[PDB]
Structure 1
Amino acid sequence: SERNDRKVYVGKVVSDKMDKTITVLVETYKTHKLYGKRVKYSKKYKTHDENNSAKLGDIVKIQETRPLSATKRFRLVEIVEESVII
């Protein structure tokens, strides 16, 4: 169906040491109900890489997929910015 511009989430990578797979750490910062401030807590979304194309430390975003396996759903869509020693 053509309705969803999928949930696109920027992130960076934490591993490539599994087949067809990487582990993005997308991150945000969200407020706290009692107070009125902001603070940042991360997650670790697993992923389906096509052939382990992109790297560790890479800067990439993703999209909703469908359940492909047990505790990985998302795809890769587009690596934005790749580099080595920083």
Structure 2
Amino acid sequence: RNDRKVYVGKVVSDVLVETYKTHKLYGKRVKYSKKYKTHDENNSAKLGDIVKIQETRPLSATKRFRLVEIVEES
């Protein structure tokens, strides 16, 4: 078929997906994070859990991801 983007992150409100942005001029890696509002269905996950998410069609004004699996419990 085709593959949808997958991320792993920590719940910050019941997902933060911290990544690195290498500096264009100096070459140093700098940590940056982006919050991915995701769809949890039956409110299963809680704050601090490390979760896996997958990209979906728009679900609301800002939700574009579905929580597929919980990796590390809060």
Same fold (TM over 0.5): yes
Q: Does 1:13 pair with 2:11? A: yes
Deviation at 1:48, TM superposition (A): 0.6
Match of 1:30 among 5, 21, 38: 21
Q: Does 1:51 pair with 2:42? A: yes
Richer in strand (by share) = 2
Deviation at 1:4, TM superposition (A): 2.3
CA distance in 1: counterparts of 2:60 and 2:47, whole angstroms: 22
Larger Rg: 1
CA distance in 1: counterparts of 2:70 and 2:22, whole angstroms: 29
CA distance in 2: counterparts of 1:35 and 1:41, whole angstroms: 16
TM-score (norm 1): 0.79
Give the share of equivalent positions with the same residue, in percent. 100
Deviation at 1:51, TM superposition (A): 1.0
Deviation at 1:8, TM superposition (A): 0.7
SS in 2 for 1:29: strand
Deviation at 1:13, TM superposition (A): 0.5
Deviation at 1:57, TM superposition (A): 0.6
CA distance in 1: counterparts of 2:19 and 2:41, whole angstroms: 26
CA distance in 2: counterparts of 1:73 and 1:60, whole angstroms: 15
Corresponding pairs, count = 73
TM-score (norm 2): 0.91
What does the per-residue CA deviation read over 1:2-53, in whole Å, with 9 as the maximum and x for residues that have no partner? x3222110000011xxxxxxxx011111201111110101111101111101
